Design a protein around this motif. Structure first.
Motif, mmCIF file in Angstrom:
data_model
loop_
_atom_site.group_PDB
_atom_site.id
_atom_site.type_symbol
_atom_site.label_atom_id
_atom_site.label_comp_id
_atom_site.label_asym_id
_atom_site.label_seq_id
_atom_site.Cartn_x
_atom_site.Cartn_y
_atom_site.Cartn_z
ATOM 1 N N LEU A 1 -22.949 77.061 -41.637
ATOM 2 C CA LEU A 1 -22.848 78.084 -40.626
ATOM 3 C C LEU A 1 -24.235 78.897 -40.865
ATOM 4 C CD1 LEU A 1 -19.573 79.787 -41.482
ATOM 5 C CD2 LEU A 1 -20.279 78.775 -39.307
ATOM 6 N N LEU A 2 -24.937 78.813 -41.988
ATOM 7 C CA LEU A 2 -26.120 79.831 -42.160
ATOM 8 C C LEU A 2 -27.290 78.978 -41.103
ATOM 9 C CD1 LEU A 2 -28.054 81.776 -43.131
ATOM 10 C CD2 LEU A 2 -28.585 80.274 -45.352
ATOM 11 N N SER A 3 -27.265 77.784 -41.136
ATOM 12 C CA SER A 3 -28.161 76.806 -40.287
ATOM 13 C C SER A 3 -27.935 77.401 -38.833
ATOM 14 C CB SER A 3 -27.953 75.503 -40.660
ATOM 15 O OG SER A 3 -28.293 74.918 -41.798
ATOM 16 N N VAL A 4 -26.882 77.316 -38.479
ATOM 17 C CA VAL A 4 -26.319 77.520 -37.107
ATOM 18 C C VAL A 4 -26.720 78.900 -36.786
ATOM 19 C CG1 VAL A 4 -24.622 77.669 -35.140
ATOM 20 C CG2 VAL A 4 -24.449 75.918 -37.165
ATOM 21 N N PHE A 5 -26.493 79.862 -37.535
ATOM 22 C CA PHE A 5 -26.649 81.097 -37.594
ATOM 23 C C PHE A 5 -28.240 81.354 -37.295
ATOM 24 C CE2 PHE A 5 -28.180 85.420 -39.270
ATOM 25 C CZ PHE A 5 -27.245 86.197 -38.658
ATOM 26 N N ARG A 6 -28.947 80.848 -38.167
ATOM 27 C CA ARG A 6 -30.446 80.915 -38.247
ATOM 28 C C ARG A 6 -31.036 80.492 -36.727
ATOM 29 N NH1 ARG A 6 -34.062 79.951 -43.458
ATOM 30 N NH2 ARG A 6 -35.441 80.274 -41.882
ATOM 31 N N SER A 7 -30.384 79.417 -36.463
ATOM 32 C CA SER A 7 -30.935 78.869 -34.893
ATOM 33 C C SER A 7 -30.657 79.856 -33.780
ATOM 34 C CB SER A 7 -30.131 77.452 -34.829
ATOM 35 O OG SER A 7 -30.602 76.890 -33.517
ATOM 36 N N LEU A 8 -29.228 80.177 -33.886
ATOM 37 C CA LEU A 8 -28.771 81.093 -32.791
ATOM 38 C C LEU A 8 -29.384 82.326 -32.567
ATOM 39 C CD1 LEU A 8 -26.916 81.427 -30.381
ATOM 40 C CD2 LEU A 8 -25.357 82.159 -32.072
ATOM 41 N N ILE A 9 -29.721 82.934 -33.716
ATOM 42 C CA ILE A 9 -30.447 84.239 -33.786
ATOM 43 C C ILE A 9 -31.767 84.223 -33.357
ATOM 44 C CG2 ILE A 9 -30.925 86.323 -35.267
ATOM 45 C CD1 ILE A 9 -27.837 86.183 -34.281
ATOM 46 N N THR A 10 -32.470 83.161 -33.987
ATOM 47 C CA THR A 10 -33.978 82.920 -33.523
ATOM 48 C C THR A 10 -33.949 82.707 -31.878
ATOM 49 O OG1 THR A 10 -34.379 81.941 -35.740
ATOM 50 C CG2 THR A 10 -35.962 81.496 -34.198
#
Lengths: 227, 229
Positions: free
Chosen positions: A145-154
């Motif tokens: 999830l952290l990976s997806v979160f970082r990608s999406l927010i960026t």
């Protein structure tokens, strides 16, 4: 500890183990622009653990009519992040993202005073209802999830900064990623059926009914079903 | 998305890319008990405070006797030790607030008070560059350590320790003793300067030292800084 490298969206992130809904919290509490609210689960979104449930607070200094474009910013952001994980997502007007016609994410935008709340619910590792899908099901493996979160927010931060400079640019981008030129059934509003041909400057869906009349459907109380 | 399962500590987590210090923010903000503030970097570190480390503060409002308030620093230190153990690192406590590995500092605890609010600050070297003499989890383990994994472990241990602290503060005092570096020579400085053997800690958290002269003195912390000779 999240290591976000963003300008506006993500300067502040508030996490909750559980909450009624990230949008609810965002609308009822003061948060600086760019603040992201995220939770493992939503009680009154029933958004299960494993998914990415978040809301972002925005207060863009752009014309009152350009506000409706924010839903598209969220949808495109999801499509871009999915691409990074080798998934091809397509936008179903006005706020859903589909993968092979199965819903993998939804966007919900709400206005409260001089602030806009951009809510995004993305199925990642959580269980989903029939007809829907998740990144896990699409990739055959759990995804961090952290990976997806970082990608999406960026991605969202970049899209938002560009939006603030030129609000009109998002339109062509969402078009290139939206399912158009097909028969649809409108849920809500006038319950129209016809050919979804395009979206206008405001984000309204331009549809040609079988009667030959061309109408513009507004976002809000609407959903679509492909026929 | 963090996946915490706790009762009080970690019910709310606020993250910043960079701030002066997590303790300063915790002091100037009105937050519910158990709220955790974390940042990638502290420019004026209270809890030189580089990307790669775990910098956080926890807001607490303990319903315990005033005399037990001083034990909160020990609660933070024990929490760090328990988390390090989970990561196979043998950290020991340097009274009253530091955690050392092979006698190199890997973490520090800083507790501050403001009215009924207690701010528990913790700084733990994970993947960040460290000062001379200090060490980090990455240096000890051989490779980068996911900050999220360390955070989840630490906050979970601290939540359990806090619940038990509320029930019986003495349990934390005993745990800090069990994980403290004792039986060795140290130097104390403050009201004065003297050397001796740190032998134990009393129920209030005072360090008991046997001076080379033969005298035995009890010392109150904060009111000290300890060095191992």
């Amino acid at each position: 500890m999240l290591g976000l490298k963003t300008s506006i969206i993500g300067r502040r992130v508030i996490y909750f183990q559980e909450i009624t809904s990230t949008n609810e919290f965002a609308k009822t509490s003061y948060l600086e622009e760019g603040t992201v609210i995220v939770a493992d689960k939503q009680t009154m979104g029933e958004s299960p653990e494993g998914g990415l449930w978040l809301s972002i607070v925005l207060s863009p200094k752009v014309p009152q009519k350009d506000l409706p474009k924010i839903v598209f910013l969220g949808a495109v952001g999801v499509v871009e992040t999915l691409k990074e994980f080798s998934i091809d997502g397509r936008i179903k007007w006005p706020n859903d993202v589909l993968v092979n016609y199965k819903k993998i994410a939804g966007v919900l935008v709400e206005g409260k005073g001089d602030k806009i709340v951009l809510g995004i619910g993305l199925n990642v590792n959580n269980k989903v209802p029939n007809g829907a899908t998740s990144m896990k099901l699409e990739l055959g493996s759990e995804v961090p999830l952290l990976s997806v979160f970082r990608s999406l927010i960026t991605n969202l931060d970049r899209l938002y900064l560009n939006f603030l400079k030129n609000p009109m640019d998002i339109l062509n981008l969402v078009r290139d990623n939206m399912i158009l030129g097909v028969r649809v059934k409108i849920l809500g509003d006038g319950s129209f059926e016809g050919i979804a041909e395009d979206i206008d400057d405001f984000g309204r869906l331009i549809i040609r009914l079988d009667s030959g009349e061309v109408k513009k459907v507004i976002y809000g109380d609407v959903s679509l079903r492909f026929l």
